Amino acid sequence: NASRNAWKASGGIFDIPQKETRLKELERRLEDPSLWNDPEAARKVSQEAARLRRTVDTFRSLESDLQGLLELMEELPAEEREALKPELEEAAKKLDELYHQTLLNFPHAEKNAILTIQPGAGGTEACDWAEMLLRMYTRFAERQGFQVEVVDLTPGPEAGIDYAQILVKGENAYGLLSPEAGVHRLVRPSPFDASGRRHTSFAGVEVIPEVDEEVEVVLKPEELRIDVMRASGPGGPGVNTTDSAVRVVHLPTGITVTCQTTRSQIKNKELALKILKARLYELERKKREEELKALRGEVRPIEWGSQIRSYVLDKNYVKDHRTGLMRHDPENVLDGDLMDLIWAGLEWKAGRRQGTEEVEAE
Amino acid sequence: GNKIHPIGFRLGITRDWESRWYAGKKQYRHLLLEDQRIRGLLEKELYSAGLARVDIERAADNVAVTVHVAKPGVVIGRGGERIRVLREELAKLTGKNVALNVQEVQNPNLSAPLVAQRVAEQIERRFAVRRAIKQAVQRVMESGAKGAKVIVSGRIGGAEQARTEWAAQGRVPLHTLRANIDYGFALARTTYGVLGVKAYIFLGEV
Amino acid sequence: ARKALIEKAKRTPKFKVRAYTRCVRCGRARSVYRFFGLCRICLRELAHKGQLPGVRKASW
RNA sequence: CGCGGGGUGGAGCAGCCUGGUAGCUCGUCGGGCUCAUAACCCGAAGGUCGUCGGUUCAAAUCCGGCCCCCGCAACCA
RNA sequence: AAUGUAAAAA
RNA sequence: AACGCGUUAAGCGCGCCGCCUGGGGAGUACGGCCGCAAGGCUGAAACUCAAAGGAAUUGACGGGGGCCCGCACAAGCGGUGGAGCAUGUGGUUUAAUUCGAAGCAACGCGAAGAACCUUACCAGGCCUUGACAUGCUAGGGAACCCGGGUGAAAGCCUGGGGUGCCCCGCGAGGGGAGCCCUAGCACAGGUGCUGCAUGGCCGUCGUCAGCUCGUGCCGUGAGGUGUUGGGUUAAGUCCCGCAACGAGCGCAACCCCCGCCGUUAGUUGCCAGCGGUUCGGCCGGGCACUCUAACGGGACUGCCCGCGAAAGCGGGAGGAAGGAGGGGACGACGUCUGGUCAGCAUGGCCCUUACGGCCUGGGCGACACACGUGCUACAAUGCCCACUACAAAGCGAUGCCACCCGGCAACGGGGAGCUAAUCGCAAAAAGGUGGGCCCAGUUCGGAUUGGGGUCUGCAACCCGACCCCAUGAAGCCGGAAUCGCUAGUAAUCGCGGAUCA
Ligand SMILES: [Mg+2]
Ligand SMILES: [Mg+2]
Ligand SMILES: [Mg+2]
Ligand SMILES: [Mg+2]
Ligand SMILES: [Mg+2]
Ligand SMILES: [Mg+2]
Ligand SMILES: [Mg+2]
Ligand SMILES: [Mg+2]
Ligand SMILES: [Mg+2]
Ligand SMILES: [Mg+2]
Ligand SMILES: [Mg+2]
Ligand SMILES: [Mg+2]
Ligand SMILES: [Mg+2]
Ligand SMILES: [Mg+2]
Ligand SMILES: [Mg+2]
Ligand SMILES: [Mg+2]
Ligand SMILES: [Mg+2]
Ligand SMILES: [Mg+2]
Ligand SMILES: [Mg+2]
Ligand SMILES: [Mg+2]
Ligand SMILES: [Mg+2]
Ligand SMILES: [Mg+2]
Ligand SMILES: [Mg+2]
Ligand SMILES: [Mg+2]
Ligand SMILES: [Mg+2]
Ligand SMILES: [Mg+2]
Ligand SMILES: [Mg+2]
Ligand SMILES: [Mg+2]
Ligand SMILES: [Mg+2]
Ligand SMILES: [Mg+2]
Ligand SMILES: [Mg+2]
Ligand SMILES: [Mg+2]
Ligand SMILES: [Mg+2]
Ligand SMILES: [Mg+2]
Ligand SMILES: [Mg+2]
Ligand SMILES: [Mg+2]
Ligand SMILES: [Mg+2]
Ligand SMILES: [Mg+2]
Ligand SMILES: [Mg+2]
Ligand SMILES: [Mg+2]
Ligand SMILES: [Mg+2]
Ligand SMILES: [Mg+2]
Ligand SMILES: [Mg+2]
Ligand SMILES: [Mg+2]
Ligand SMILES: [Mg+2]
Ligand SMILES: [Mg+2]
Ligand SMILES: [Mg+2]
Ligand SMILES: [Mg+2]
Ligand SMILES: [Mg+2]
Ligand SMILES: [Mg+2]
Ligand SMILES: [Mg+2]
Ligand SMILES: [Mg+2]
Ligand SMILES: [Mg+2]
Ligand SMILES: [Mg+2]
Ligand SMILES: [Mg+2]
Ligand SMILES: [Mg+2]
Ligand SMILES: [Mg+2]
Ligand SMILES: [Mg+2]
Ligand SMILES: [Mg+2]
Ligand SMILES: [Mg+2]
Ligand SMILES: [Mg+2]
Ligand SMILES: [Mg+2]
Ligand SMILES: [Mg+2]
Ligand SMILES: [Mg+2]
Ligand SMILES: [Mg+2]
Ligand SMILES: [Mg+2]
Ligand SMILES: [Mg+2]
Ligand SMILES: [Mg+2]
Ligand SMILES: [Mg+2]
Ligand SMILES: [Mg+2]
Ligand SMILES: [Mg+2]
Ligand SMILES: [Mg+2]
Ligand SMILES: [Mg+2]
Ligand SMILES: [Mg+2]
Ligand SMILES: [Mg+2]
Ligand SMILES: [Mg+2]
Ligand SMILES: [Mg+2]
Ligand SMILES: [Mg+2]
Ligand SMILES: [Mg+2]
Ligand SMILES: [Mg+2]
Ligand SMILES: [Mg+2]
Ligand SMILES: [Mg+2]
Ligand SMILES: [Mg+2]
Ligand SMILES: [Mg+2]
Ligand SMILES: [Mg+2]
Ligand SMILES: [Mg+2]
Ligand SMILES: [Mg+2]
Ligand SMILES: [Mg+2]
Ligand SMILES: [Mg+2]
Ligand SMILES: [Mg+2]
Ligand SMILES: [Mg+2]
Ligand SMILES: [Mg+2]
Ligand SMILES: [Mg+2]
Ligand SMILES: [Mg+2]
Ligand SMILES: [Mg+2]
Ligand SMILES: [Mg+2]
Ligand SMILES: [Mg+2]
Ligand SMILES: [Mg+2]
Ligand SMILES: [Mg+2]
Ligand SMILES: [Mg+2]
Ligand SMILES: [Mg+2]
Ligand SMILES: [Mg+2]
Ligand SMILES: [Mg+2]
Ligand SMILES: [Mg+2]
Ligand SMILES: [Mg+2]
Ligand SMILES: [Mg+2]
Ligand SMILES: [Mg+2]
Ligand SMILES: [Mg+2]
Ligand SMILES: [Mg+2]
Ligand SMILES: [Mg+2]
Ligand SMILES: [Mg+2]
Ligand SMILES: [Mg+2]
Ligand SMILES: [Mg+2]
Ligand SMILES: [Mg+2]
Ligand SMILES: [Mg+2]
Ligand SMILES: [Mg+2]
Ligand SMILES: [Mg+2]
Ligand SMILES: [Mg+2]
Ligand SMILES: [Mg+2]
Ligand SMILES: [Mg+2]
Ligand SMILES: [Mg+2]
Ligand SMILES: [Mg+2]
Ligand SMILES: [Mg+2]
Ligand SMILES: [Mg+2]
Ligand SMILES: [Mg+2]
Ligand SMILES: [Mg+2]
Ligand SMILES: [Mg+2]
Ligand SMILES: [Mg+2]
Ligand SMILES: [Mg+2]
Ligand SMILES: [Mg+2]
Ligand SMILES: [Zn+2]
């Protein structure tokens, strides 16, 4: 297990010098009496002190399992050297906590997730590749300990999928499948091509947890104003002296509506409200779109080069264009070996591009 | 696409068994294993002079290895120093009677197993493989012969895609038995991979 | 698992049945004749070289 | 709210009036012909009969309330 | 008695 | 430009008008003029492409044509698809179910021997120039043999025995070769990737008759001619003709088995021939015959007839065998970016207390399914039991085992013959004769399973095979569909060998 040591060790090492200088500018700010006088402004101050716990603990735990472990173990069959191995069996136990406490910090990492696959540039082979990816994440779920349900799926003309969607249950379902965003790339001699030469094919992937609803709470009586007024058109003296028309404007949203199709004020006041309900439902569905579709991807051309990870079956090599990381087993990776990818490199760069954005300028 | 080994095609005519003797339901396996590793040492520390064929004759502890170098000069040395030290190593790894004879070569340009090693030599030397084959054929045909043929297949000139280069002249009916055709294969270790060579010299008839 | 494996078939430092056939030239395990102690492949090469006395391309 | 109709395999429709066994087309699934897909051939699976009650030996079927969809009507001053 | 996309000639 | 034109110029000249100036946009838009209208005349650009085109050449292709071929179709027999089982694969499952093969040309294929071995996978215990090579430095120990502690084995830890061969010597001792061990360096090792880097070998259309070169002639040129054409054959086989003539790789032929026969050969064989006989070719005896494995002979459209220019074809006689007598070996220039880097070799790439090495146990034998290849049957042209006759080719001395004894039996014991035309595996089965069953899920059918038992091998839970008793399943001829075979063939019956305890 000496191949993942320096990876996890140095992983908690780059936070040492940076947080060292910042916590110093804060800890000395917590001294002067004039600081705490600020109401909630001072909470943001003592808050950063609540981080000197989830940083100094590694300065002690990770540093001790590096100074003591690396010593007595350089050479010996099983005497005092192999006996020092179980001494750090908890070093892999504690490795779990440092890894976890940097993934759940995502928006909704803890809850489940939905993953929709859809073919793209690459002809009918691309339509066939999508089913491969489906069968990849599917096995990756069971083997991760997750449950799976195909929420929807549609076979292609000759391939096997023009579209597919799969809800993965279990904790951190959105966390692990997060870096699976974007279009992947496939390279291999096309099984559908007569000359069988090497063709490229693409396919997009998306991930997102889940939400709820709120239909009636909107039509709170406190919000909208209701008006009464005589009706336009026929009626006799009854129409002139009896106001039955109604105008139910929604004050906040400003959207108004008027009705007077029936001789009655209540049945108009009633209808005019069922009408406002429909429009206010269609106004909540429009705003319900940006906050449930912008999370998918701010782009995703699915074209060429829009990919973030290529899988070449000719020369046998996958490659994450994000971490620059490489590999030599596309045949197994497209079966469940996503852990090696998501764990070390994927979640890293994923949180890195946002973790370097906040701790600098954003 | 087929083309069987003309040598094996004539183990009942033309070419006679390279190793020739007799064994039983218990000696054949051994008398072959050792017999083989014999030529193993000779293929190496003897080709340095153009070793073509190598016979074997036995019956009981007797062994008559008849080398056919193009130049016996290197196999003997100048009197008996070299040729003797061979029987040395031989009897060394084999507690049996040696008998290293040394037949000759009336003309190396007519031993296919030689011409093969010939062109194959020029290959590793890094020279043309179209011009080369042409010489080795025009030489074999000019140096008296009924027919001849040479072939090299693989990365001709270290090129990306493989290939196969053809060159031949005169009659060479591999389907006729009353033909006789010296055959000889040869490799060519290079910085870009192996590379097979073949020689088809048409000799006798009837 | 090719060289230390042909070596395994040689030492016979253990039980009877555990020893098994093996080719002399290559190291094959299946299709290895006892008569020559060779795999079907090389046997065909050698038999075309005449390096197997008495043997000849049969036909009837 | 009033009067009329409807809700049955995944889609669209029979069956109810005259209670006893739920049928048709499509799709789905297995197997064929084709280099392969479709077409075509051979098999197979699939229905709480909206829901809650009532009558009956027995309810898709008859009786009643409810939810849902459809159409009509909502006129005189 | 229809169809078969998109990376190969020193 | 070629196709073609050619006193009906697309020739050679003069006069005049009309018209073209890359494709798409586009005969569109705008404007103008005409029209009842539909629409016509005139007639752009932005933008965009690196081509759009003409004629001709080779080839591929056609629900184009002519000629011709192959169990390709038809005529005919027997099959799979159905059932149970074996096996190969898909898939699913698993700690792993190691890898490859993918229409024909992957699917009883690599595997001509997965219980550990094999074995490349998994779990676990372990070793770190290492199981194997070449070479440098070093201490110690000869080589080599032997046991105890430890354990699942591997490995680890440890004791006794031992004192050979060379240099200085009476000895002591010390220096050297070889081998093993520790330490260290160079290096090993990899069934780890890439058959879209390769050799080699192989499948493939296809045993199809075809594919080319030299010189010559035609064309500006790709290229054509030859190889086309009339006749024929299994064939680019031959015949004739031909602006071509000639040659090469392919079909043939030269090799093998099987048919008839002769010579060489007499431990195979035969009272065929006489004698003897424990009447078994056992003895005397002979090479006839059979057989045995060596060399030859014979068949070539040679002979008669009809047609024909010839080649050749049709019929007949003789012949064991007539136009290739039957079967095999042999498969062109090439095509499939075919197959295999896992048989081996190999360029590049990757790992190196490890992607290498050792063992014990597991898996490759997993099962809700699907396909391929196959075995056994549904029965009376049959099943069972007893008796009786006829093969070929093969294999066997730590191997095949006659013969007698025990046992229901597989097997166990005693024990003869045999480096084998001399002895054994060895009843060949179907068939012949006899006898019973009498149309029944049955004496058909033996899947399944309970119990008992034999053999191999350290070891049969996972996971072998065989024997005996008992239990006897699906299956009454198989949906759509699909396979093989033209003669000693299909069908059917049994025997052998490789692989290997
Ligand atoms: Mg309020
Ligand atoms: Mg108004
Ligand atoms: Mg009115
Ligand atoms: Mg009024
Ligand atoms: Mg009023
Ligand atoms: Mg009022
Ligand atoms: Mg070759
Ligand atoms: Mg060429
Ligand atoms: Mg010539
Ligand atoms: Mg090389
Ligand atoms: Mg090895
Ligand atoms: Mg074995
Ligand atoms: Mg419905
Ligand atoms: Mg009725
Ligand atoms: Mg009725
Ligand atoms: Mg249907
Ligand atoms: Mg179907
Ligand atoms: Mg079917
Ligand atoms: Mg059916
Ligand atoms: Mg079904
Ligand atoms: Mg009801
Ligand atoms: Mg509705
Ligand atoms: Mg509605
Ligand atoms: Mg109305
Ligand atoms: Mg009214
Ligand atoms: Mg009114
Ligand atoms: Mg009125
Ligand atoms: Mg009125
Ligand atoms: Mg009135
Ligand atoms: Mg070039
Ligand atoms: Mg003319
Ligand atoms: Mg004229
Ligand atoms: Mg005139
Ligand atoms: Mg004229
Ligand atoms: Mg212009
Ligand atoms: Mg233009
Ligand atoms: Mg115009
Ligand atoms: Mg127009
Ligand atoms: Mg206009
Ligand atoms: Mg005008
Ligand atoms: Mg006008
Ligand atoms: Mg006018
Ligand atoms: Mg008009
Ligand atoms: Mg009109
Ligand atoms: Mg118009
Ligand atoms: Mg107009
Ligand atoms: Mg007009
Ligand atoms: Mg104008
Ligand atoms: Mg103009
Ligand atoms: Mg204009
Ligand atoms: Mg044209
Ligand atoms: Mg044609
Ligand atoms: Mg037609
Ligand atoms: Mg015609
Ligand atoms: Mg015609
Ligand atoms: Mg016609
Ligand atoms: Mg057929
Ligand atoms: Mg038929
Ligand atoms: Mg017929
Ligand atoms: Mg059947
Ligand atoms: Mg079946
Ligand atoms: Mg079946
Ligand atoms: Mg397999
Ligand atoms: Mg499955
Ligand atoms: Mg496992
Ligand atoms: Mg499997
Ligand atoms: Mg496989
Ligand atoms: Mg085995
Ligand atoms: Mg060593
Ligand atoms: Mg040395
Ligand atoms: Mg040194
Ligand atoms: Mg010593
Ligand atoms: Mg010692
Ligand atoms: Mg000593
Ligand atoms: Mg003990
Ligand atoms: Mg011990
Ligand atoms: Mg000595
Ligand atoms: Mg001395
Ligand atoms: Mg002394
Ligand atoms: Mg001493
Ligand atoms: Mg020494
Ligand atoms: Mg030494
Ligand atoms: Mg290797
Ligand atoms: Mg290939
Ligand atoms: Mg190759
Ligand atoms: Mg032919
Ligand atoms: Mg010319
Ligand atoms: Mg031709
Ligand atoms: Mg003809
Ligand atoms: Mg002529
Ligand atoms: Mg002529
Ligand atoms: Mg002969
Ligand atoms: Mg005579
Ligand atoms: Mg007599
Ligand atoms: Mg007589
Ligand atoms: Mg008598
Ligand atoms: Mg006698
Ligand atoms: Mg006598
Ligand atoms: Mg003779
Ligand atoms: Mg003849
Ligand atoms: Mg004649
Ligand atoms: Mg004649
Ligand atoms: Mg006459
Ligand atoms: Mg003539
Ligand atoms: Mg004549
Ligand atoms: Mg004549
Ligand atoms: Mg005739
Ligand atoms: Mg034949
Ligand atoms: Mg031939
Ligand atoms: Mg299952
Ligand atoms: Mg299938
Ligand atoms: Mg009997
Ligand atoms: Mg008997
Ligand atoms: Mg007999
Ligand atoms: Mg034998
Ligand atoms: Mg033996
Ligand atoms: Mg006895
Ligand atoms: Mg017994
Ligand atoms: Mg016994
Ligand atoms: Mg006895
Ligand atoms: Mg004896
Ligand atoms: Mg004998
Ligand atoms: Mg004998
Ligand atoms: Mg016998
Ligand atoms: Mg019955
Ligand atoms: Mg009966
Ligand atoms: Mg045991
Ligand atoms: Mg049945
Ligand atoms: Mg079929
Ligand atoms: Mg036939
Ligand atoms: Zn081999």
Short mmCIF file of C-alpha atoms (C1' of nucleotides) in Angstrom, two decimals, chain F residues 251-355:
data_model
loop_
_atom_site.label_atom_id
_atom_site.label_comp_id
_atom_site.label_asym_id
_atom_site.label_seq_id
_atom_site.Cartn_x
_atom_site.Cartn_y
_atom_site.Cartn_z
"C1'" C F 251 -4.25 -27.45 -63.70
"C1'" A F 252 -1.83 -31.43 -65.26
"C1'" A F 253 2.69 -35.01 -64.61
"C1'" C F 254 6.76 -36.82 -61.51
"C1'" C F 255 5.23 -39.29 -54.85
"C1'" C F 256 1.63 -42.43 -51.61
"C1'" C F 257 -2.76 -46.08 -50.49
"C1'" C F 258 -6.37 -49.17 -53.08
"C1'" G F 259 -7.57 -52.56 -57.77
"C1'" C F 260 -4.87 -57.08 -61.78
"C1'" C F 261 0.12 -59.58 -62.39
"C1'" G F 262 5.25 -61.15 -62.35
"C1'" U F 263 10.39 -61.61 -60.10
"C1'" U F 264 13.37 -61.64 -55.27
"C1'" A F 265 11.87 -63.77 -50.09
"C1'" G F 266 9.99 -68.65 -46.76
"C1'" U F 267 9.34 -69.00 -38.47
"C1'" U F 268 3.01 -66.09 -42.39
"C1'" G F 269 0.64 -69.58 -44.92
"C1'" C F 270 -1.40 -74.94 -46.72
"C1'" C F 271 -2.40 -83.27 -45.50
"C1'" A F 272 -3.27 -78.16 -51.58
"C1'" G F 273 0.90 -83.47 -51.43
"C1'" C F 274 2.33 -88.09 -48.78
"C1'" G F 275 3.34 -89.86 -43.56
"C1'" G F 276 2.40 -89.47 -38.38
"C1'" U F 277 -1.09 -87.24 -34.75
"C1'" U F 278 -2.08 -86.13 -27.36
"C1'" C F 279 -6.31 -85.08 -34.50
"C1'" G F 280 -4.69 -77.73 -32.16
"C1'" G F 281 -0.65 -76.62 -39.06
"C1'" C F 282 1.29 -79.83 -33.25
"C1'" C F 283 5.71 -83.11 -36.17
"C1'" G F 284 8.15 -84.77 -40.82
"C1'" G F 285 7.99 -81.68 -45.00
"C1'" G F 286 7.44 -78.19 -49.28
"C1'" C F 287 7.11 -72.10 -51.89
"C1'" A F 288 1.97 -74.32 -54.85
"C1'" C F 289 -1.51 -70.75 -52.60
"C1'" U F 290 -2.73 -66.91 -48.77
"C1'" C F 291 -0.34 -63.42 -46.55
"C1'" U F 292 4.15 -60.55 -45.86
"C1'" A F 293 7.20 -55.58 -47.97
"C1'" A F 294 10.87 -54.57 -52.33
"C1'" C F 295 11.43 -53.83 -57.49
"C1'" G F 296 8.57 -54.26 -62.06
"C1'" G F 297 4.84 -55.12 -65.62
"C1'" G F 298 -0.11 -52.94 -67.50
"C1'" A F 299 -3.86 -48.28 -70.18
"C1'" C F 300 -1.34 -44.85 -74.63
"C1'" U F 301 -8.14 -42.68 -77.82
"C1'" G F 302 -3.07 -48.02 -79.29
"C1'" C F 303 -7.58 -51.16 -82.18
"C1'" C F 304 -12.75 -51.29 -85.33
"C1'" C F 305 -17.03 -47.78 -86.52
"C1'" G F 306 -19.95 -42.58 -87.22
"C1'" C F 307 -18.96 -37.18 -87.24
"C1'" G F 308 -14.84 -33.74 -87.66
"C1'" A F 309 -9.94 -29.18 -90.30
"C1'" A F 310 -7.72 -30.60 -86.09
"C1'" A F 311 -8.04 -31.21 -81.19
"C1'" G F 312 -11.94 -34.45 -79.73
"C1'" C F 313 -16.47 -36.70 -78.95
"C1'" G F 314 -20.20 -40.73 -79.46
"C1'" G F 315 -20.55 -46.44 -79.80
"C1'" G F 316 -18.00 -51.45 -79.84
"C1'" A F 317 -14.04 -55.46 -78.82
"C1'" G F 318 -10.36 -57.09 -75.91
"C1'" G F 319 -8.97 -56.09 -70.66
"C1'" A F 320 -8.68 -56.92 -63.40
"C1'" A F 321 -9.09 -51.99 -64.68
"C1'" G F 322 -10.96 -47.06 -70.75
"C1'" G F 323 -10.76 -41.28 -71.83
"C1'" A F 324 -8.63 -38.50 -64.58
"C1'" G F 325 -10.42 -46.38 -62.72
"C1'" G F 326 -11.42 -44.87 -56.99
"C1'" G F 327 -9.11 -42.11 -52.85
"C1'" G F 328 -4.86 -38.96 -50.88
"C1'" A F 329 -0.57 -35.67 -50.86
"C1'" C F 330 0.00 -30.97 -53.38
"C1'" G F 331 -3.50 -25.29 -53.11
"C1'" A F 332 -1.20 -19.44 -58.11
"C1'" C F 333 -0.59 -13.06 -58.30
"C1'" G F 334 -3.47 -12.11 -54.34
"C1'" U F 335 -8.06 -10.66 -50.81
"C1'" C F 336 -9.97 -10.32 -46.30
"C1'" U F 337 -6.09 -3.37 -41.67
"C1'" G F 338 -8.51 -11.95 -41.39
"C1'" G F 339 -5.96 -15.08 -37.02
"C1'" U F 340 -2.05 -15.65 -33.23
"C1'" C F 341 3.12 -11.00 -29.63
"C1'" A F 342 -0.54 -16.99 -24.99
"C1'" G F 343 3.83 -21.82 -28.78
"C1'" C F 344 8.23 -19.43 -29.94
"C1'" A F 345 10.82 -15.17 -31.90
"C1'" U F 346 10.50 -9.69 -31.90
"C1'" G F 347 10.48 -3.14 -32.32
"C1'" G F 348 8.36 0.09 -28.99
"C1'" C F 349 5.65 0.47 -24.17
"C1'" C F 350 4.99 -0.70 -18.82
"C1'" C F 351 6.31 -3.03 -13.53
"C1'" U F 352 10.74 -4.30 -10.77
"C1'" U F 353 10.42 -6.29 -2.32
"C1'" A F 354 7.38 -5.53 -7.25
"C1'" C F 355 2.71 -6.43 -13.00
#
